[PDB]
Design a protein around this ligand. Structure first.
Ligand SMILES: Nc1cccc2c(=O)[nH]c(-c3ccccc3)cc12
Ligand SMILES: [Zn+2]
Length: 207
């Protein structure tokens, strides 16, 4: 039931999604090992992901969480990078999309920094890089990220499928060492995220 609608680059919605993608690149402590070396992206396409059944699954859960949290869903727009992006946009998020070994347990991980999600496009640790050249810093191959609507509800703050900590709907990984890193978030129910935008891009080689 999923259809993908291309956004025009002239569209304010394209421009705002692109700006969030570009403006949340940072340097990574691995020197680029997992995600490659770059300061910005070449955005090739931004598509709106439209699926009525998946949207209603999301809004149903969102209302549940809101009602458990003084009418506050605590909804964010966050990045997700994954080898399973095609399954996700067709079938929705589920336990198969969880990062089993993540530092906050087996859940589905989201980033404020697009460059954090970029590290997972080719797998954990960047896997073996792009399928064509086996290059985690490939500047040729097209990558995809999701920009997702995520319900956090009451989030457990960790200074840094399983179940959420009791009394909570998600976990927040607050960086405590790298002062430039933005937060990361984990949900333990696939129904708490909707993959709203599919972004196709290249990383760009610094000049
Ligand atoms: N640990 C993370 C922090 C912030 C964002 C992500 C992410 O986008 N994907 C992933 C990811 C996605 C699929 C399978 C394994 C890991 C992890 C991640
Ligand atoms: Zn490549």
């Amino acid at each position: 039931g999923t259809i993908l609608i291309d956004l025009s680059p002239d569209d304010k919605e394209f421009q705002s999604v692109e700006e969030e993608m570009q403006s949340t690149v940072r340097e990574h402590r691995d020197g680029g090992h997992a995600g490659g070396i770059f300061n910005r992206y070449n955005i090739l396409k931004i598509q709106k992901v439209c699926n009525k059944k998946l949207w209603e699954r999301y809004t149903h859960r969102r209302k549940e969480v809101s009602e458990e949290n003084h009418n506050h869903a605590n909804e964010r727009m966050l990045f997700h990078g994954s080898p399973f992006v095609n399954a996700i946009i067709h079938k929705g998020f589920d336990e198969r999309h969880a990062y089993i070994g993540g530092m906050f347990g087996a859940g589905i991980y989201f980033a404020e920094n697009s460059s954090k999600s970029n590290q997972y496009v080719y797998g954990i640790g960047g896997g073996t890089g792009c399928p064509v050249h086996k290059d985690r810093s490939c500047y040729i191959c097209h990558r995809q990220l999701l920009f997702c609507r995520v319900t956090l509800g009451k989030s457990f703050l960790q200074f840094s499928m399983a179940h959420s900590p009791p009394g909570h709907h998600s976990v927040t990984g607050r960086p405590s060492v790298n002062g430039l890193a933005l937060a990361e978030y984990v949900i333990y129910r696939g129904e708490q995220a909707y993959p709203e935008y599919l972004i196709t891009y290249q990383i760009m080689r610094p000049e």
